[PDB]
Short mmCIF file of C-alpha atoms in Angstrom, two decimals:
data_model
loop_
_atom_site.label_atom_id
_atom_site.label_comp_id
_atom_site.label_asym_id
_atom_site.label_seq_id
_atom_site.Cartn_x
_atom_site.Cartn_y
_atom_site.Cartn_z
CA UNK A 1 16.24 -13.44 7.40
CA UNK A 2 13.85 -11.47 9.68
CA UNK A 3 14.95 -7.64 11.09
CA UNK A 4 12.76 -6.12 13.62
CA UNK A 5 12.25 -2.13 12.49
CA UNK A 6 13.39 -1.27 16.49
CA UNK A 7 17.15 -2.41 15.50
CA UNK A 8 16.68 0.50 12.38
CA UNK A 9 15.54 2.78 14.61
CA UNK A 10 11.73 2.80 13.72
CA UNK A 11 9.55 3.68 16.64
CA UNK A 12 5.94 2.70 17.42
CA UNK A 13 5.23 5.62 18.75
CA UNK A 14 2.49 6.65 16.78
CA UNK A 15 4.05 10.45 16.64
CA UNK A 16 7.72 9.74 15.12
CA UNK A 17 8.04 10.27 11.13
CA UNK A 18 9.91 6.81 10.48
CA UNK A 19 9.72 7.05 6.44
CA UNK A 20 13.67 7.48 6.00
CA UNK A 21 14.64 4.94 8.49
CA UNK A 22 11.90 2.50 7.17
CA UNK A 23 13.27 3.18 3.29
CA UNK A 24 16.76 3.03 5.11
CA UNK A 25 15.66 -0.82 6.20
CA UNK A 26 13.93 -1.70 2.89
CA UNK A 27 17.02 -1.07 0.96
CA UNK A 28 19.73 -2.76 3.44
CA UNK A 29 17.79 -5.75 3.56
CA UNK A 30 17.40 -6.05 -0.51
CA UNK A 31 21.43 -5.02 -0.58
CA UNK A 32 21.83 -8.47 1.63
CA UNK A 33 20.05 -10.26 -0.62
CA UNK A 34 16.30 -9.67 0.61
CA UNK A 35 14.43 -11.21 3.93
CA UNK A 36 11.84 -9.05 5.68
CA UNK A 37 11.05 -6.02 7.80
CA UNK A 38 8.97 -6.75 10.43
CA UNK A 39 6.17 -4.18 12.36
CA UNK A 40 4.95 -6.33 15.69
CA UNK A 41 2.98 -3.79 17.42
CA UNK A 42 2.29 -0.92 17.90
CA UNK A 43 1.76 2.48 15.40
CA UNK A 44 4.04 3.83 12.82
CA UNK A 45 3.78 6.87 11.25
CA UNK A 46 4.98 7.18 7.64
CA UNK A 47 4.82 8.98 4.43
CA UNK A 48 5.66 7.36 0.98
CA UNK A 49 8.13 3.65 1.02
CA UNK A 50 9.42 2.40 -1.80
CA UNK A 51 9.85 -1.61 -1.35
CA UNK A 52 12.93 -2.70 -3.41
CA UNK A 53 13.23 -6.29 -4.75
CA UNK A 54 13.32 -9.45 -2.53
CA UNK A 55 11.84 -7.61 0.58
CA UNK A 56 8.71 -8.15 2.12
CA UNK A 57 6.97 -6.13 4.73
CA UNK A 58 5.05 -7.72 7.21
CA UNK A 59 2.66 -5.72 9.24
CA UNK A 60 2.03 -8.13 12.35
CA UNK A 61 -1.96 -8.10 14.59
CA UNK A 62 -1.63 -4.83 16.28
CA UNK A 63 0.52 -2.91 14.21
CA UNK A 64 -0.30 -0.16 12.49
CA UNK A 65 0.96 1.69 9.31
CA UNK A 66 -0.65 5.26 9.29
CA UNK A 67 0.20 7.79 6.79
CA UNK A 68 1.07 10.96 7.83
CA UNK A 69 -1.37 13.89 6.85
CA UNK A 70 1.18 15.52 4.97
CA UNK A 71 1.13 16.00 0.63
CA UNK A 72 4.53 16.74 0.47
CA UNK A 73 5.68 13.32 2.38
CA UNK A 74 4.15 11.03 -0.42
CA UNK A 75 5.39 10.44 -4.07
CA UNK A 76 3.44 12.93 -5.71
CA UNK A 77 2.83 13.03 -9.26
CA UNK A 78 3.77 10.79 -12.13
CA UNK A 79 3.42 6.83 -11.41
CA UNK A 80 2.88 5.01 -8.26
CA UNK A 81 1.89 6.92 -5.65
CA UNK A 82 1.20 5.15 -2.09
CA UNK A 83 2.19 4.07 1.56
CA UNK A 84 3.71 0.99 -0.21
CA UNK A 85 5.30 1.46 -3.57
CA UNK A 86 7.29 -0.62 -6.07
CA UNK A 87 8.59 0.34 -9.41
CA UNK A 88 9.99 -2.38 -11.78
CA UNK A 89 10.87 -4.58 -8.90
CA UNK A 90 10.51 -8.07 -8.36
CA UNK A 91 9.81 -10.80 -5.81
CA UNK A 92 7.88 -8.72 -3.13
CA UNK A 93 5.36 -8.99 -0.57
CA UNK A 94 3.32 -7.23 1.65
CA UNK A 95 1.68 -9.49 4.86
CA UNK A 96 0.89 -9.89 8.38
CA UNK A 97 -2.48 -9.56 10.11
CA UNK A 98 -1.92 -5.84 10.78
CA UNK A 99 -3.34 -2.19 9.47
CA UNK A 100 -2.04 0.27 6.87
CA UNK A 101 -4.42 3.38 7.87
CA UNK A 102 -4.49 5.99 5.19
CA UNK A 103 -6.09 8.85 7.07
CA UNK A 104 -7.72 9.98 4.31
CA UNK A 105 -9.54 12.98 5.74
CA UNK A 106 -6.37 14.85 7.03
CA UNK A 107 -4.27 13.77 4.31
CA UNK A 108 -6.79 15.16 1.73
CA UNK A 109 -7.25 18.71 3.50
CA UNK A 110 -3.10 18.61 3.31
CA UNK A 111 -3.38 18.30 -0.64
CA UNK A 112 -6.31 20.73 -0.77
CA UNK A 113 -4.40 23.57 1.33
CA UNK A 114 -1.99 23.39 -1.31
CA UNK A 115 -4.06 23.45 -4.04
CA UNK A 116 -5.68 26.52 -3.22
CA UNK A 117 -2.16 27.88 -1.62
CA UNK A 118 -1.17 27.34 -5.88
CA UNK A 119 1.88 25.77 -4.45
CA UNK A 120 1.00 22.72 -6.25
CA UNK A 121 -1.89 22.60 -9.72
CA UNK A 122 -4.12 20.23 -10.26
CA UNK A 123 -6.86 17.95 -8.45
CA UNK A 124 -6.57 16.21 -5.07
CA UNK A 125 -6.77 12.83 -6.81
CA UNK A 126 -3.74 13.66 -8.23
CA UNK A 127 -1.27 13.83 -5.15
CA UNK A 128 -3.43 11.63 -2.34
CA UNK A 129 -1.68 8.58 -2.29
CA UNK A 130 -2.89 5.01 -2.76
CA UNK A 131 -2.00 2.70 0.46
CA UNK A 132 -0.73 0.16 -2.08
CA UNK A 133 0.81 0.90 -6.04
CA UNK A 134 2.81 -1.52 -7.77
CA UNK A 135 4.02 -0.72 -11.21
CA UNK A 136 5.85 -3.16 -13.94
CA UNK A 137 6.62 -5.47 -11.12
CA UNK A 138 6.70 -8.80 -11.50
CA UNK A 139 6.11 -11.74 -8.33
CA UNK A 140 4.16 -10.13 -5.99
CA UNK A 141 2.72 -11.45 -2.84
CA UNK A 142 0.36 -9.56 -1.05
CA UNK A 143 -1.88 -10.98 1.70
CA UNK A 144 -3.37 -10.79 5.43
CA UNK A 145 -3.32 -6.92 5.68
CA UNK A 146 -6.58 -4.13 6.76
CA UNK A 147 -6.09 -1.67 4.31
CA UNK A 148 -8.27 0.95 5.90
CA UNK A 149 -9.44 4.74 4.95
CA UNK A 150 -7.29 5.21 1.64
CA UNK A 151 -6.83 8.59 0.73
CA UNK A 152 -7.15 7.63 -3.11
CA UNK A 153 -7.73 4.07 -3.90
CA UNK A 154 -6.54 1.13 -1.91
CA UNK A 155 -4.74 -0.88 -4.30
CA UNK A 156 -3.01 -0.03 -8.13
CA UNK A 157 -1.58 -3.12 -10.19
CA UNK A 158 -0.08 -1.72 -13.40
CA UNK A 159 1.63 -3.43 -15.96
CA UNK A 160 2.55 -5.86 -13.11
CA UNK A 161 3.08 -9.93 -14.02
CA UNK A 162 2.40 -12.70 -11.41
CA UNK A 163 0.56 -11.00 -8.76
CA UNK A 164 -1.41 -12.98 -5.69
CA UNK A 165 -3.63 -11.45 -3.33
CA UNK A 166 -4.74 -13.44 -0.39
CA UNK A 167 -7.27 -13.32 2.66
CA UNK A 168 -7.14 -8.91 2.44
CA UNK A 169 -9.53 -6.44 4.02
CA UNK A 170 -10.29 -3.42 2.26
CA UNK A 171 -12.33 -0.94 4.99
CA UNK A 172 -13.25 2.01 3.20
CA UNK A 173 -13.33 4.59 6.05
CA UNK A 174 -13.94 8.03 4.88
CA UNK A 175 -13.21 7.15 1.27
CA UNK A 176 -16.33 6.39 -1.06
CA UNK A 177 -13.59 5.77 -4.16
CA UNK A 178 -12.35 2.43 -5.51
CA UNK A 179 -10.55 0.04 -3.35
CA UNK A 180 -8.48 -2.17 -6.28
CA UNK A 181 -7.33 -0.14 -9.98
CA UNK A 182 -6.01 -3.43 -12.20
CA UNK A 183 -4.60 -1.95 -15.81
CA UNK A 184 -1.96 -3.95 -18.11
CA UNK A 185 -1.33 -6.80 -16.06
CA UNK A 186 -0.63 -10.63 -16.58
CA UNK A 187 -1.85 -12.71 -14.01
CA UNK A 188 -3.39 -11.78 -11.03
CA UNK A 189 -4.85 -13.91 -8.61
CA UNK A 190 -7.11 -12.50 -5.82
CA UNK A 191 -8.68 -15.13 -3.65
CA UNK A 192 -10.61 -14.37 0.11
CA UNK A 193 -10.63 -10.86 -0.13
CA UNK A 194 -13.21 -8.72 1.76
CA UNK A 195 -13.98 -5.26 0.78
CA UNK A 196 -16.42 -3.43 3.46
CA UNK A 197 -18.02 -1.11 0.89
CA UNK A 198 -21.01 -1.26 -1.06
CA UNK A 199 -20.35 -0.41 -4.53
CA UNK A 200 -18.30 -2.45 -6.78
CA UNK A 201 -14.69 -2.25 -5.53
CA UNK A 202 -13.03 -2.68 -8.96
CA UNK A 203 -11.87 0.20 -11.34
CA UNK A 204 -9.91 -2.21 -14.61
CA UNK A 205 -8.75 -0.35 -17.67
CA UNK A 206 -9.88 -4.05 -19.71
CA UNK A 207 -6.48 -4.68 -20.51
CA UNK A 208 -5.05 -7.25 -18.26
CA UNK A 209 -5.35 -10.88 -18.38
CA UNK A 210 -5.42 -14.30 -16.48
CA UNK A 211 -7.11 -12.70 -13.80
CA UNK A 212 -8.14 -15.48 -10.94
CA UNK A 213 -11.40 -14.01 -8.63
CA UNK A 214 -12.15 -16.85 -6.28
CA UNK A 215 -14.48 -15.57 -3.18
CA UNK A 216 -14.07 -12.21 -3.25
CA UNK A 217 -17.32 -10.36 -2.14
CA UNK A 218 -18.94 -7.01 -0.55
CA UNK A 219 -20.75 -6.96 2.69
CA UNK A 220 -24.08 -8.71 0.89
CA UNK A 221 -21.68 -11.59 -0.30
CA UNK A 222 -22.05 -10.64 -3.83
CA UNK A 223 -18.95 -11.74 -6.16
CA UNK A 224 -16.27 -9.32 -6.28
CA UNK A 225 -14.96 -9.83 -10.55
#
């Protein structure tokens, strides 16, 4: 089963901070035995989600996902921090034709304030989020999506088993880092993906296997591997 975010009280306002009604969503649907949470048009501000098993988010052609540019609204420290996050879940997806925008500019001057504030310790890298992280998760679907202007890396697969990623755009906005960080995980499948950068797009640890690169290039059409 479908569920507009409107009938959760998410608004596409662009302005509204919709994280707790969007997490609220995410974990009713998985309670009823998963579906997805759909985002037809229009923008929705968010900090940190956590997707829960069996639910699938689905960004529809012109919606957007922006992050607010707030450090204390994302995960923070210690494992997956992102837009999108799963921990140990399974049977998950991210799709639809839409944006997640990661503002990475404002979001980074958030982290630095409170770096040099000392309200926090450490390096930036440390608390910008990701726009996706999936960690020890196991069937995941991810496809269609712009991930634009992340305010770390695009994309973390850890530890994560059966993963496909299909016909994504990774625009690198502001951000001259990494768009995809791969460590630990057991087949991964990335086919059709575009990444707008220059550079190569992939960060690996070496310590995953049965990865599947078919037509995955940078703007010159070289093989993305």
């Amino acid at each position: 089963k479908d569920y507009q975010v409107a009938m959760f009280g998410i608004k596409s306002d662009g302005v509204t901070l919709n994280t707790r009604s969007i997490q609220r969503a995410v974990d009713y649907i998985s309670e009823q035995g998963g579906g997805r949470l759909i985002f037809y048009v229009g923008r929705y501000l968010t900090g940190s989600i956590e997707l829960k098993s069996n639910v699938t988010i689905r960004i529809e052609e012109g919606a957007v996902l922006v992050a607010v540019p707030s450090v204390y609204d994302f995960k923070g420290v210690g494992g997956c921090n992102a837009i999108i996050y799963a921990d140990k879940q399974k049977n998950i997806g991210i799709g639809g034709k839409g944006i997640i925008d990661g503002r990475s500019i404002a979001v980074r001057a958030s982290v630095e304030e409170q770096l040099q504030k000392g309200h926090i310790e450490g390096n930036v890298s440390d608390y910008a989020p990701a726009l996706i992280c999936m960690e020890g998760c196991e069937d995941v679907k991810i496809e269609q999506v712009t991930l634009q202007d992340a305010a770390n890396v695009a994309e973390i697969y850890k530890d994560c088993h059966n993963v496909t990623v299909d016909k994504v755009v990774v625009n690198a906005g502001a951000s001259d880092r990494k768009a995809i960080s791969i460590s630990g995980c057991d087949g991964v499948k990335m086919t059709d993906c575009y990444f707008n950068m220059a550079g190569n797009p992939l960060e690996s640890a070496g310590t995953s296997r049965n990865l599947i690169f078919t037509n995955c290039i940078t703007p010159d059409g070289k093989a993305v591997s």
